[PDB]
């Protein structure tokens, strides 16, 4: 929808930009912001959550050529490394693809919340905005943002601008 995103939004991570009679203005939705954060936070904590301890292991550098045993001690340690390295490449890749889809869905969700709220008093412009079909002054706007907009109130006004003129 929003083919772009807003630079200069520093109140939070997701937000509302409105325009009415009283003028334009902006404000961040803190609840869905923290929602994204708390997930990333916890995902991140599980990755960097306390590692192993290891003490007396095998030798991994060698001065002389010994043949068979040494050949095996180095194969073992190389085979280890190669696997753990794969694990780490895959982990990050997965975790990232997720961290993206997580945050894209959070935006997505806020939009729906806002659409269900406006019910039949507004239409989706196509770029992730709404054309609200009534006089929505600044009080009315925060009423939407803070989850209290009663549609049953502006129904008649809106409904009629939409289907007439």
């Amino acid at each position, epitope marked *: 929808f929003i083919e772009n995103g807003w630079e200069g939004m520093i109140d939070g991570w997701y937000g509302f930009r409105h325009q009415n009679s009283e003028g334009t203005g902006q404000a961040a939705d*803190l609840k869905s*912001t*923290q929602a994204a954060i708390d997930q990333i*936070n916890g995902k*991140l*904590n599980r990755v960097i959550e306390k590692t192993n301890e290891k003490f007396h292991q095998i030798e991994k550098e060698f001065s002389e050529v010994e043949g068979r045993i040494q050949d095996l001690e180095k194969y073992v340690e190389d085979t280890k490394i190669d696997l753990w390295s794969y694990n780490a490449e895959l982990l990050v890749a997965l975790e990232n693809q997720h961290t993206i889809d997580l945050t894209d869905s959070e935006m997505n969700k806020l939009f729906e919340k806002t659409r269900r709220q406006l019910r039949e008093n507004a239409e989706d412009m196509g770029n992730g905005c709404f054309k609200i079909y009534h006089k929505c002054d600044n009080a009315c706007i925060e009423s939407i943002r803070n989850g209290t907009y009663d549609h049953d109130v502006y129904r008649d006004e809106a409904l009629n601008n939409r289907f007439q003129i």
Partner: nanobody
Framework: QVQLVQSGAEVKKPGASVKVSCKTSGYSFSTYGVSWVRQAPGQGPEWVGWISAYTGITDYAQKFQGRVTLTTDATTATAFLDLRSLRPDDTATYFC???????????????????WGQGTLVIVSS
């Protein structure tokens, strides 16, 4: 620097309710929630609830639910705790403490109960 000054001891009777203030300072109030823990004399601490100063979200311990209400006032930078229907059981000393990090990037868990109120005694006697 960073501190949490709580209200002086209140004393209330079995029916009534109570409200305890926790004034904060030295850090920006809204980027950190608040955890509340109480302590019946001689026993160990038990957790009461938590509220975010960023998102207004709360999580009460299910033991109290109903009886307990957490709020915050960003202007004065204060968290409040309201407990109703006080039993004599609830006679305890009540602590607030900084907890969770809100908005900001993330982690790990570096607090998470960084700093605590000096404690505020509540006595429920008739």
């Amino acid at each position: 620097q960073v501190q949490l000054v709580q209200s002086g001891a209140e004393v209330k009777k079995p029916g009534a309710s109570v409200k305890v203030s926790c004034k904060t300072s030295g850090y920006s109030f809204s980027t950190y929630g608040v955890s509340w823990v109480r302590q019946a004399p001689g026993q160990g601490p038990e957790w009461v609830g938590w509220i975010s100063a960023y998102t207004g979200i709360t999580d009460y311990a299910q033991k109290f639910q109903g009886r307990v209400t957490l709020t915050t006032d960003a202007t004065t930078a204060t968290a409040f705790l309201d407990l109703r229907s006080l039993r004599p059981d609830d006679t305890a000393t009540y602590f607030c403490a900084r907890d969770k990090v809100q908005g900001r990037v993330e982690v790990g868990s570096g607090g998470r109960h960084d700093y605590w109120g000096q404690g505020t005694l509540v006595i429920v006697s008739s």
